[PDB]
Design an enzyme around this catalytic site. Structure first.
Site, PDB file in Angstrom:
ATOM      1  N   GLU A  74      19.103  56.388  79.538  1.00 36.56           N
ATOM      2  CA  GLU A  74      20.143  57.402  79.695  1.00 36.56           C
ATOM      3  C   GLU A  74      21.515  56.886  79.154  1.00 36.56           C
ATOM      4  O   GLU A  74      21.785  55.680  79.124  1.00 36.56           O
ATOM      5  CB  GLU A  74      20.273  57.802  81.168  1.00 36.56           C
ATOM      6  CG  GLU A  74      19.377  58.979  81.545  1.00 36.56           C
ATOM      7  CD  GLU A  74      20.153  60.284  81.696  1.00 36.56           C
ATOM      8  OE1 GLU A  74      21.026  60.618  80.810  1.00 36.56           O
ATOM      9  OE2 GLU A  74      19.932  61.044  82.712  1.00 36.56           O
ATOM     10  N   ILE A 119      24.608  57.832  80.354  1.00 32.63           N
ATOM     11  CA  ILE A 119      25.494  57.579  81.464  1.00 32.63           C
ATOM     12  C   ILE A 119      24.881  58.000  82.792  1.00 32.63           C
ATOM     13  O   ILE A 119      24.075  58.929  82.839  1.00 32.63           O
ATOM     14  CB  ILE A 119      26.835  58.301  81.281  1.00 32.63           C
ATOM     15  CG1 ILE A 119      27.850  57.928  82.370  1.00 32.63           C
ATOM     16  CG2 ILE A 119      26.708  59.825  81.311  1.00 32.63           C
ATOM     17  CD1 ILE A 119      29.243  58.515  82.137  1.00 32.63           C
ATOM     18  N   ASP A 157      26.369  58.681  86.554  1.00 27.70           N
ATOM     19  CA  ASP A 157      27.565  58.842  87.385  1.00 27.70           C
ATOM     20  C   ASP A 157      27.162  59.404  88.738  1.00 27.70           C
ATOM     21  O   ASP A 157      27.093  58.703  89.744  1.00 27.70           O
ATOM     22  CB  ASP A 157      28.628  59.715  86.700  1.00 27.70           C
ATOM     23  CG  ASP A 157      28.082  60.920  85.946  1.00 27.70           C
ATOM     24  OD1 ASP A 157      27.211  61.684  86.502  1.00 27.70           O
ATOM     25  OD2 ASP A 157      28.508  61.179  84.756  1.00 27.70           O
ATOM     26  N   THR A 158      26.870  60.665  88.830  1.00 23.46           N
ATOM     27  CA  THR A 158      26.467  61.160  90.134  1.00 23.46           C
ATOM     28  C   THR A 158      25.077  60.666  90.470  1.00 23.46           C
ATOM     29  O   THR A 158      24.714  60.598  91.644  1.00 23.46           O
ATOM     30  CB  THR A 158      26.439  62.690  90.189  1.00 23.46           C
ATOM     31  OG1 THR A 158      25.400  63.190  89.361  1.00 23.46           O
ATOM     32  CG2 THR A 158      27.748  63.332  89.744  1.00 23.46           C
ATOM     33  N   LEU A 163      22.414  62.250  90.156  1.00 25.33           N
ATOM     34  CA  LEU A 163      21.526  63.318  90.619  1.00 25.33           C
ATOM     35  C   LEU A 163      20.292  63.575  89.706  1.00 25.33           C
ATOM     36  O   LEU A 163      19.162  63.638  90.177  1.00 25.33           O
ATOM     37  CB  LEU A 163      22.340  64.597  90.840  1.00 25.33           C
ATOM     38  CG  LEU A 163      23.365  64.496  91.975  1.00 25.33           C
ATOM     39  CD1 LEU A 163      24.329  65.675  91.943  1.00 25.33           C
ATOM     40  CD2 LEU A 163      22.647  64.427  93.304  1.00 25.33           C
ATOM     41  N   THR A 164      20.507  63.674  88.398  1.00 18.00           N
ATOM     42  CA  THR A 164      19.408  63.901  87.466  1.00 18.00           C
ATOM     43  C   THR A 164      18.544  62.662  87.311  1.00 18.00           C
ATOM     44  O   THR A 164      17.327  62.741  87.358  1.00 18.00           O
ATOM     45  CB  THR A 164      19.933  64.293  86.086  1.00 18.00           C
ATOM     46  OG1 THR A 164      20.711  65.489  86.199  1.00 18.00           O
ATOM     47  CG2 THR A 164      18.788  64.514  85.121  1.00 18.00           C
ATOM     48  N   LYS A 188      29.113  54.677  85.858  1.00 20.02           N
ATOM     49  CA  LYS A 188      30.311  54.911  86.670  1.00 20.02           C
ATOM     50  C   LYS A 188      29.799  54.658  88.099  1.00 20.02           C
ATOM     51  O   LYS A 188      29.381  55.596  88.810  1.00 20.02           O
ATOM     52  CB  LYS A 188      30.807  56.347  86.560  1.00 20.02           C
ATOM     53  CG  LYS A 188      31.662  56.630  85.365  1.00 20.02           C
ATOM     54  CD  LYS A 188      32.303  58.002  85.477  1.00 20.02           C
ATOM     55  CE  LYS A 188      32.970  58.378  84.154  1.00 20.02           C
ATOM     56  NZ  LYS A 188      33.552  59.751  84.163  1.00 20.02           N
ATOM     57  N   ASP A 206      29.267  63.338  75.206  1.00 18.48           N
ATOM     58  CA  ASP A 206      30.031  64.466  74.696  1.00 18.48           C
ATOM     59  C   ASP A 206      31.081  65.070  75.600  1.00 18.48           C
ATOM     60  O   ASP A 206      31.098  64.840  76.809  1.00 18.48           O
ATOM     61  CB  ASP A 206      29.052  65.630  74.419  1.00 18.48           C
ATOM     62  CG  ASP A 206      28.498  66.247  75.725  1.00 18.48           C
ATOM     63  OD1 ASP A 206      27.891  65.514  76.532  1.00 18.48           O
ATOM     64  OD2 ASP A 206      28.709  67.453  75.982  1.00 18.48           O
TER      65      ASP A 206
END
Ligand SMILES: O=c1[nH]cnc2c([C@@H]3O[C@H](CO)[C@@H](O)[C@H]3O)n[nH]c12
Ligand SMILES: O=c1[nH]cnc2c([C@@H]3O[C@H](CO)[C@@H](O)[C@H]3O)n[nH]c12
Lengths: 175, 186
Positions: free
Chosen positions: B107, B109, B111-112, B114-115, B139, B167
């Site tokens: 991946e 990035i 960050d959360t 979730l995915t 992050k 992006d």
């Protein structure tokens, strides 16, 4: 490469040719008013083979300040679309990206399909062209290298989904 | 880079970091029984953002003689507020089975998370030999669900970063460097 034969094109040679092709593309679209958000050059990358070429090509285009939108598609033949573009190409300048065109059966099918969707313009860029392997007439707009009828691997090209990761394009079965 | 506020990592810095991660992976899987064709390390690249990182990573892995198979998957989110567990729709899954294989989800990035957490659990039930993740950027303070990437090219603070596949409204993915987008843009 102990499992293959001679190196057809080194990574540096490929990088250099890609930079020149990107330079030509930038020049050709210079008066088309390409702009991010509303009018980027849409690169339709045919998976899996073109992933590496696409990654390097889009960066060379960036070097010439050409704004691009990346799309990835997947097809299968028994040609059916497994994955198509996520955004409409209508009114856009589209460039289909392929690692190699030989028989041109797939690329011609995709070119026909996209042509009917009313893009502002539709061209094709191929890393390798075996101009003699045609099963249907097809002329790519930009070609990084024309090659003989040799089976090559590396830089995205595979031998039954293996060896796509090589930095160089090498001859598996000579020409 | 008139739209950029700061350069976080240059193309050369990223290249070096990718090679370092590649060496780590090689070291980690050396005794794992990977072998060309029959048992390659399977990289499941999550489109669109990881396309660039995957191209450079697989080449760095090749430098270390790590045999790899590339899979590209495409997912789509649900309309707004339909999921609170990071569920996504699978538009394109792996073309070949991962059972018995060493898999690495790639991946751009996390960050959360979730995915990535959802994808990780999804592939985990498919019985791969092992399942790990490698992210270009992390992050760490952005989590909405706990998640630790196994390999990370670079940690970043909470800024709007673009470039090298990442992006802003499907724009700037093609930059060679990783930069911070000027707030005046978004
Ligand atoms: O040279 C090649 N290499 C890999 N795949 C193909 C398909 N046609 N030609 C080639
Ligand atoms: O820093 C970022 N940049 C771009 N896209 C995202 C999504 N989360 N975080 C970021």
């Amino acid at each position: 490469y102990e499992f293959a034969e001679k190196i057809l094109f080194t990574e540096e040679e490929i990088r250099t040719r890609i930079k020149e092709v990107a330079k030509r593309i930038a020049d050709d679209y210079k008066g088309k008013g390409l702009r991010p958000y509303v009018n980027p050059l849409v690169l339709i990358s045919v998976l899996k083979g073109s992933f590496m070429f696409t990654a390097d090509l889009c960066r060379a285009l960036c070097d010439f300040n050409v704004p691009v939108r990346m799309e990835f598609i997947c097809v299968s033949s028994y040609v059916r679309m497994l994955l198509d573009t996520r955004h409409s190409i209508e009114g856009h300048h589209v460039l289909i990206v392929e690692d190699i065109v030989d028989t041109a059966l797939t690329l011609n099918y995709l070119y026909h399909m996209y042509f009917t969707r009313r893009p502002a313009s539709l061209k094709t860029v191929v890393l390798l062209d075996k101009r003699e392997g045609r099963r249907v007439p097809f002329s790519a707009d930009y070609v990084v290298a024309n090659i003989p009828n040799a089976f090559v691997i590396g830089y995205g090209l595979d031998y039954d989904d293996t060896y796509r990761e090589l930095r160089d394009i090498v001859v598996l079965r000579p020409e």
